[PDB]
Design a protein around this ligand. Structure first.
Ligand code: AJP
Ligand code: POV
Ligand code: POV
Ligand code: CMP
Ligand code: CMP
Lengths: 906, 906
């Protein structure tokens, strides 16, 4: 009968976890005491003796084949795989060297110390016991208050690889000790070790790949994914166990890593459910095994008490701590030299990071029960129980004190300021809306004291060289926060990628940490491109290149390099847009001329270098650029569409059912975006004919233009037309970036594909008024003046296309004037562009040469012509924007030009 | 060895579920066929017969104690408890009558038909086998295309109660048949039946209450809830089974119902994880048992084939169908008479809803295996397998055809129009944002054909009496859609409750069903107030009123009646708001005078009745009104706060860590709102002294006013002041609603608590200009003119309070004038109120009697005084709003009044 024991264990674990969670000490100790308490009555009363003797006397096989695989698979499941594989090499090498040296040193000191009549096998398996560790508690504290990510991942990898090597070493030595009937020839031993090392992971990789391929063809379902995944994990464990009593754990760890790595073939609800399932199983097993070890140690170790071991436990603890410290200190400088070193803080927090856990105690139980009636088992269990109960509390409190005294988990002034500002805005909004609500009729009888008590929130965070140094430091912090606020902004609109975001912000902090320093480019230079071992191996293999695999290998190689290329182009675009924003916003923050001009100069210099390198890599491969541009466009369209549908739901136009259905349709489209192939096809120069906005809807005119245009090419830094020269014709820019300067104070700007050149000269039969110079090798289509007359003829009875053309020629001239206006002060190009789009162009014929000016219109600008005022009678040279005091405007008949104007009504 | 059997079971279930899901036929029979296939190859090969013999000949005990509890607990878990308890009485009586009459008729026809040498017990247990049914398939089809909720709930309840009664009857009679050694004295039998009926549900209720109480004290945790809930369910099942072979299933069903009923003590993620867990377990058991029955029937029934039973199966099917149809038809008129009847469509959809499922087949396996080597078990298994395989496919195809031909699942024109409009808005938004994006620099090289192909979405839904009748019908539909669009709006801003929302919209739907009809009031009359059995019993018990329970009983009674009171007041408020809004908006939809005036008259009439009854119930209990008002206020403040923090996240001002933290703080506050006690304390008339906006911050003046004001009371429909009479003084309205009419065309309006009366007369030393009449018994505070002079004295060096007073007296006069303005055409009171709040009042001293008028100001209005124009020199009687052509305004020195003006700048 076992029900009462398991139920009591669950209840005690729940109550302890609830009660004792406030203190930083892990709960696991106190329940251990409960087990000891039970031992006190276990001998005393026959009843509890009956129950605990029924349970505690279990076979070692059940523990060895059940409790360990669950624990290790849990330790391997909940882990950011990407952060792991970004530090895999250093974490694995350091972990395995550290574990082997720790094991051998503690074994030889055990030989030197106890004078126990032991072979080297006992010592080395003892060392394998103390080599293991528990990462759940330390990562729990770090997620509680440490506020660091990389530290948790590296300590997790440390613990995981340590546990794997420890368990294989222990199992093989247990076989070799307690089953002496087996031969130990070298060939079978090395063959066994090699197949343990290799075949397991390959078997796990194969089963993971095939089950992911199976899952890839199932959509909008929930049950089949869970059932298939659980069945696959069990079959993997069963095969890997029947072949080897070790290979199962490594195979299932590899399976867990691979399954976690995949994301797009498994919906998020499935993975959150699986995460919770495995976490619950691990928690239950951990609680049961801790209570079990508590009762067995308090009922066995009472007969082997003396001062000798009670004094030697302390020196054992000091020994393991000092050896771990010296080995990691010895490996610090080589990691620094290789370019993968850490700080003092990381080293010292890793130094006291080793927390012995359930794995070592499980090994203690299995060796104790398998050893039979002997003093060795009692000594083993007492030693490991004492060492774990000591090290848990001591190392927990020293981590707490160390985190306080070194204080890397301190708060920073900038984020405190940001939180204070956010709370200010929230409380202001609350005040405004409650003041609005107070005026309502029905909602006036409410007592507002309890209201303002309940609704209110709280902040959770609560000449000289010296002056020049501190002001440039605070300017450095201000440009840092301007950068990071910008980067968060473009990510939120949907202009950039999440991993690109984290890479770029971590570049931000690492630039921030250095004194009087900002973001460099050598780190970026290595960031966007790759000269490593992967490009060399891939180029040499594709140059030197059973038949069908090779195309698959080369295509997956091209995919794996294009991914890095895309990420690099993305981070370049994000960095450049961030620089231009911070430079354009910081121009009025401070008045110290030298600092502002020097920072603007270095920002401009870096801008030039990054745009130069970006142009170089763009010329290397345009297809990746067009692919990422399309991906960006679809991302942002989907984002804005989902915002619009949420808004439409907000006005109540839809029941929740159809909103839910359309949300799923949008989510399906986004999921298809994730699996969009990174194809790199350059677009032909003929699709753009249909993509012109003001040539849209005219197939006949498009064909005529294709039959009446000349392809023109220009080299780097060439000039097409110059200011004041005769109108050579009309052009459409279709490749490259171009610069333009003219009379507006000479204005200068840069335009790109999607513009017409020489429109004013063709419309007015007038020479050039500005100079256009191409910045690189470009191509355009040129249209002659006779072809322009033919186009005017082919306008026929639809000059609304010509009306849109006149709208564009008004767009050319109005936006600089609207920018130089007080009513649109501080207005972005998007704001003004979305403003005048709703406006309409007007002629003088529909007004019969006389217009009345009302207050309905918001803005009005006339381009050219002969217009007079009816009341003021003042000759004003158009374009000219004045106040709305003028009410009537008179017009005359002119033949040299056609007078028109534009109105925007709000 | 059974591993290959279970693994193949899972694989076949997954592939059959995935492949065959498109067709309306349930997947199950497909795998059934596979089981049959296995049978015919089971005899072929020793290996397969070895495996199938190993697994198939399990004990009856394992199936009876494992498979059934899981299946019934799943059937009882996934269910809306509220919709169940709103139809509990009818569903339970109908289910139990139907099952008992079905069982007895099947038994007697079995005696008349087969001529099998059977006692009556075999006949009735055999009949009880097909009394059960499966609801998962039919609810699956209904959620697929039926688009009905109540039908699924009622058929689920029918199936659940049918299964419970069937299983208890079967258990007791299999015990009585196959164990004849037991005595059948009447006393023990009736005692056993009564205790099975009662003690089980009470045991489940007790354990559910105690475990919910235990869970109520644990916050921000995930593991302990899951572990405690699962442990509680297991202990309940174990105790219920050890006490009685039947009571376990009923006890755990009650436990599942109660646990599902509670929501606020368990976070949503725990609830969804538990649902997925139990669903997966049920699916696994169902698949295994179906393929198991398939193989056993195809390997046993091959030896008992003849034309006889093969002919009698059809008439057995016809018999069960006709008896179910006739009994439900017989119960239709009595349910109609009692007031709980259903339509023809509901009756016929219930008629063909009976789908035999896994429960009957499990009973078949247990009776077959327990019967041993006999012809009876083969006959039972063949009969039930044939009847289920027939009924599933036949009733599925006929239910599909019936849904098609009767077409209650048809689409309606209004929602088709709504979806069309929504699709139009989404597509136009996409076009606008892509046209905006086309202008950007970097995002110009993308080929937009693939872009517009990928981003595009599609609609998923793709004189005479006759003319008078159709136009009034279309007006009826238009007012219906206006109402429902309103109610969705008030719910979405957070002004109403979800269950109140669904209640109101189902009233709207059932009113819409009737021809030339709209929403009545008698249905509302029973909706808000309750005259049922509960108020009578609660009144009699509290009047007639081991010691400590009675206060708990009376308090929970008061809570359970105040809940209904709150819901009624809520639905009244929602309906009055909705009818007012639709009456406001429909005034310009149509031009036919008689229909519009008649509908507006009946709407106003119903408005008068509902406001009268609402005032009556408010006078009955004011405390519930103040409680619900406070709850409404906190709800809407929290809603707007979450909106603005999402907005702040949108501008990138916050990392999503702190956004997540603040979201949890808001969620904690909202959860505390859920558990807010419905206390009903009326507010004292003294807190409002501190709650005056323009008396805020002046404790000394508040104390002075409390020492210099008179409490005044008025009866129903009384008059305080009249237009043209002398200024009696100054008042502050602090109780009730009041009406006011004056000269603006006489304006009339209604004001409430939070206003001052006679301000203009006190400021100007002038008599009344409008008449104020109270609509009910009201109370105010009155201030004399000498006290007004004392208040002016106590203004001291802070007349900014008097400036706010002048802002209020400008609020009085400006809003009717701003309403009568073209620039604010179509503007709501919220819009204008949020408009002029940012404005500022101005005097003539700071301008030195001369003001220059710029374009920065958006609006300007002068109240009174002697102002002249510098340029126009036109005498304009203030207040008067004109165009901004005036640039300079001159002022003089006046002693009889103080001239001031107000400006709003945009
Ligand atoms: C959900 C979370 C996870 C953890 C947990 O909950 C929370 O999960 C719960 C759940 O999973 C529990 C388990 C469920 C299954 C249980 C099985 C049970 O053993 C079985 O108990 C049965 C009881 O009917 C039978 O025993 C027979 O009992 C008859 C009287 O009822 C006797 O007569 C007869 O003798 C017995 O049976 C006979 O006698 C022997 C057995 O007693 C031989 O086996 C023989 O063959 C057999 O004919 C059967 O025979 C025997 O095997 C065992 O005792 C405890 C058990 C394992 C449970 C332990 C506690 C749990 C893990 C619970 C735990 C808290
Ligand atoms: C990946 C995780 C795999 C976990 C499950 C894997 C492998 C399961 C193999 C069990 C180990 C063998 C037990 C030995 C023993 O003494 O058993 C005794 C009976 O004991 C049982 O029959 C226990 C089986 C119940 C455990 C099932 C747990 C499922 C979760 C016989 O003596
Ligand atoms: C909801 C409650 C479900 C679990 C409740 C109660 C469980 C009681 C089941 C007893 C049924 C008879 C078993 C039997 O014949 O014993 C055989 C052993 O067989 C076992 O011991 C099988 C144990 C399987 C337990 C798996 C639980 C999965 C959840 C030996 O004979
Ligand atoms: N404000 C402006 N914005 C954009 N393009 C312009 C502007 N002013 C002049 N241009 C272009 O510069 C060209 C100079 O010669 P054209 O007059 O032939 O046609 C002119 C336009 O194409
Ligand atoms: N437009 C208005 N809005 C609100 N209250 C008003 C308005 N016009 C007049 N009153 C009130 O009606 C009162 C009539 O007499 P009094 O002039 O003493 O003070 C006046 C104000 O309190």
């Amino acid at each position: 009968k076992v029900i009462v024991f398991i139920s009591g264990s669950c209840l005690f674990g729940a109550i302890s976890r609830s009660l004792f969670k406030k203190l930083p000490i892990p709960y696991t100790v106190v329940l251990l005491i409960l087990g000891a308490i039970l031992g006190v009555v276990a001998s005393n009363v026959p009843l509890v003796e009956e129950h605990t003797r029924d349970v505690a006397h279990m076979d070692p096989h059940v523990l060895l084949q059940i409790f360990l695989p669950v624990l290790i698979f849990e330790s391997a499941f909940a882990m950011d795989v990407h952060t792991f594989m970004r530090s895999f090499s250093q974490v694995c090498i350091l972990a395995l060297f550290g574990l082997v040296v720790a094991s051998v040193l503690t074994a030889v000191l055990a030989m030197n110390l106890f004078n126990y009549n032991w072979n080297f096998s006992e010592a080395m398996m003892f060392g394998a016991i103390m080599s293991a560790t528990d990462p759940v508690a330390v990562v729990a504290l770090l997620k509680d208050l440490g506020a660091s990510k990389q530290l948790g991942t590296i300590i997790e990898g440390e613990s995981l690889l340590n546990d794997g090597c420890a368990i294989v070493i222990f199992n093989v030595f247990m076989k070799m000790v307690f089953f002496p009937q087996l031969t130990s020839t070298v060939g079978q031993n090395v063959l066994y070790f090699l197949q343990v090392a290799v075949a397991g992971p390959l078997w796990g990789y194969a089963v993971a790949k095939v089950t992911v391929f199976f899952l890839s063809h199932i959509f909008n379902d929930a049950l089949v994914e869970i059932t298939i995944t659980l069945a696959a994990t069990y079959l993997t464990y069963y095969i890997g166990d029947i072949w080897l009593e070790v290979s199962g754990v490594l195979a299932v760890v590899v399976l867990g890593l691979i399954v976690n790595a995949e994301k797009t073939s498994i919906s998020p609800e499935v993975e959150v459910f699986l995460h919770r399932f495995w976490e619950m199983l691990a928690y239950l097993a951990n609680t049961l095994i801790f209570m079990m070890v508590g009762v067995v140690v308090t009922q066995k170790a009472l007969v082997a008490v003396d001062k000798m071991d009670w004094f030697y436990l302390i020196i054992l603890y000091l020994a393991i701590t000092i050896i771990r410290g010296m080995v990691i200190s010895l490996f610090s400088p080589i990691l620094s030299r290789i370019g993968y070193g850490l700080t003092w803080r990381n080293a010292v927090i890793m130094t006291w990071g080793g927390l012995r856990g359930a794995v070592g105690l499980a090994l203690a139980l299995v060796v104790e029960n398998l050893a039979g009636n002997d003093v060795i088992g009692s000594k083993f269990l007492f030693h490991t129980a004492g060492i774990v109960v000591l090290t848990l509390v001591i190392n927990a409190t020293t981590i707490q004190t160390l985190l306080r005294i070194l204080g890397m988990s301190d708060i920073s002034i900038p984020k405190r300021l940001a939180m204070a500002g956010a709370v200010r805005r929230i409380h202001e909004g609350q005040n405004r809306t409650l003041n609005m609500l107070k005026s309502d009729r029905f909602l006036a009888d409410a007592d507002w004291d309890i209201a303002t008590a309940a609704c209110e929130i709280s902040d959770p965070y609560s000449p000289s060289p010296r002056e020049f140094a501190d002001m440039m430091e605070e300017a450095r912090l201000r440009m840092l926060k301007a950068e990071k606020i910008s980067y968060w902004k473009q990510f939120e609109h949907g202009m950039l990628a999440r991993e690109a975001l984290r890479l770029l912000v971590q570049h931000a902090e690492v630039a921030a940490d250095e004194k009087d320093q900002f973001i460099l480019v050598d780190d970026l230079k290595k960031s966007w491109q790759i000269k490593g071992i992967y490009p060399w191996l891939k180029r040499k293999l594709e140059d030197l290149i059973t038949k069908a695999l090779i195309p698959k290998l080369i295509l997956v190689v091209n995919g794996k390099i294009n991914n890095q290329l895309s990420l690099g182009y993305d981070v370049g675009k994000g960095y450049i847009i961030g620089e231009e924003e911070v430079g354009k916003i910081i121009d009025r923050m401070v008045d110290n001329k030298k600092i502002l001009r020097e920072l603007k100069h270095i920002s401009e210099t870096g801008r030039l270098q990054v745009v130069k390198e970006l142009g170089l890599l763009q010329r290397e491969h345009p297809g990746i650029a067009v692919s990422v541009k399309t991906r960006q466009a679809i991302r942002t369209i989907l984002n804005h569409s989902r915002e619009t549908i949420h808004e439409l739901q907000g006005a109540g136009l839809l029941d929740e059912m159809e909103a839910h259905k359309l949300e799923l349709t949008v989510e399906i489209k986004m999921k298809r975006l994730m699996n969009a192939p990174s194809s790199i096809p350059p677009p032909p120069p003929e699709n753009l004919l249909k993509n012109v906005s003001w040539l849209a809807g005219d197939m006949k005119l498009i064909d005529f233009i294709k039959a009446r245009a000349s392809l023109l090419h220009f080299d780097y830094g060439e000039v097409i037309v110059r200011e004041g020269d005769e109108s050579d014709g009309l052009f459409l820019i279709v490749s490259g970036l171009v610069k333009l300067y003219g009379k507006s104070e000479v204005f200068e700007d840069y335009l790109t594909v999607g513009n017409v050149i020489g429109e004013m000269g063709v419309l007015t039969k007038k020479p050039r008024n500005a100079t256009v110079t191409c910045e690189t090798t470009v191509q355009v289509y040129f249209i002659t003046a006779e072809d322009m007359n033919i186009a005017i003829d082919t306008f026929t009875l639809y000059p609304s296309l010509e009306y849109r053309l006149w709208r564009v020629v008004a767009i050319r001239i109005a936006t600089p004037l609207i920018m130089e206006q007080m009513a649109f002060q501080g207005w972005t190009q998007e704001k003004v562009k979305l403003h005048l789009e709703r406006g309409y162009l007007v002629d003088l014929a529909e007004s019969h040469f006389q217009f009345n000016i009302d207050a309905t219109l918001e803005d009005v600008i006339l381009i050219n012509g002969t217009a007079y005022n009816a009341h003021t009678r003042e000759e004003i040279r158009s374009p000219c924007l004045i106040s709305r005091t003028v009410h009537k405007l008179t017009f005359q008949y002119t033949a040299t030009e056609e007078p028109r104007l534009f109105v925007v009504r709000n």
